């Protein structure tokens, strides 16, 4: 019976299994592209010219 209780506890622990890792924010895309940086490219064009 002691081994039965230990087996049940191990079943619970195996199934729960919550890890030390947490997904806080799932991935969502920023709708504003990060490339190309249009303003800095045009400014660099002006200054280089």
């Amino acid at each position: 019976l002691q081994l039965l209780n230990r087996q049940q506890e191990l079943n619970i622990a195996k199934s729960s299994a919550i890890g030390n890792v947490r997904i806080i924010d799932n991935a969502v895309t920023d709708p504003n592209p990060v490339r190309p940086k249009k303003t800095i490219i045009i400014v660099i064009g002006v200054v280089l010219g």
Partner: protein
């Protein structure tokens, strides 16, 4: 803005006191799913 900041603080509080109980909550969930010699019960 004060209503928003109070909401932020309360959401943070609830998130913290839910993460603390998360492991025991999932253990209890699986135990409820696991309830079907009688000493083990």
């Amino acid at each position: 803005i004060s209503h928003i900041l109070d909401s932020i603080s309360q959401n943070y509080l609830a998130q913290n006191i839910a993460r603390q109980a998360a492991q025991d909550a999932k253990s209890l969930e699986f135990l409820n799913q696991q309830l079907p010699g009688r000493a083990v019960y």
